[PDB]
Structure formats: structure tokens, C-alpha cells
């Protein structure tokens, strides 16, 4: 039948076109930035009383 | 799933002889499902295109 079983030729494989289960998309949540409420107390200022 | 009073009473033992629930009874829930799939035969090979 021209159908031998010996050849280990396992082809190339199979292309996974899609996945059975879709991947949900979560909302991106960043974090602190340059003015991320930090303590530095350089000046402490001086508020003169007007009256 | 909501169980039944017969199951509730059969869970506790103490049944008389030839009643089946002489000893405490334990139950387990089993669920199976049946689904479709697609198989592609090419290059003398096989596999699920959608996986």
C-alpha cells in the first residue's frame, strides 16, 4: 500500500491558529509619578501676619 | 444543586438492619459535558487547528 510506518518524519507540527479560551483584557493601573506626594520640607516658609 | 430531606436523613447512620443506611452515608457530585471539535488531516498528519 506504499504506507510504511518506520519513517520517523514527524512532519513540522501544526499551527495554533487560535486558542479555545479568549484572554481577558485587564485595565492598566500605573503608580506614583514625579509629584507622588513626598516629604522634602526645604523651606517650611514664613507667613507674616498681616494684622 | 439543592439536596433532599431523604438524602439528609440517609447521610446519618443508625438505620436498622437491611435498610442500607445503617452506616453513615457519603455522597459526591460528578459533572461531565460533551462538546464538538474540528480535526484537520493534512500532510499525512492530524491535529486541532483551533486547539
Automatic annotation (TrEMBL), chain A:
Q: Which domain of life is it from?
A: Viruses
Q: What is this protein called?
A: Uncharacterized protein
UniProtKB/TrEMBL annotation, chain B:
Where does the signal sequence lie?
none
Annotated localization? Virion
- Indicate the family of this protein: Belongs to the NCLDV major capsid protein family.
What's the protein called, per UniProt? Major capsid protein
Organism name: Singapore grouper iridovirus
Section covered of the full-length record: 413 to 463 of 463
Amino acid at each position: 500500500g506504499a504506507n510504511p510506518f518506520r519513517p520517523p518524519l514527524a512532519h513540522q507540527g501544526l499551527s495554533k491558529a487560535h486558542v479555545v479560551k479568549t484572554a481577558v483584557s485587564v485595565a492598566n493601573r500605573s503608580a506614583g509619578a514625579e509629584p507622588f506626594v513626598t516629604r522634602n520640607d526645604p523651606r517650611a516658609l514664613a507667613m507674616e501676619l498681616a494684622n | 444543586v439543592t439536596m433532599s430531606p431523604e438524602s439528609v436523613v440517609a447521610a446519618a447512620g443508625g438505620g436498622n438492619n437491611n435498610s442500607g443506611y445503617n452506616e453513615p452515608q457519603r455522597f459526591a457530585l460528578v459533572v461531565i459535558a460533551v462538546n464538538h471539535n474540528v480535526i484537520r488531516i493534512m500532510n499525512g498528519s492530524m491535529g486541532f487547528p483551533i486547539l
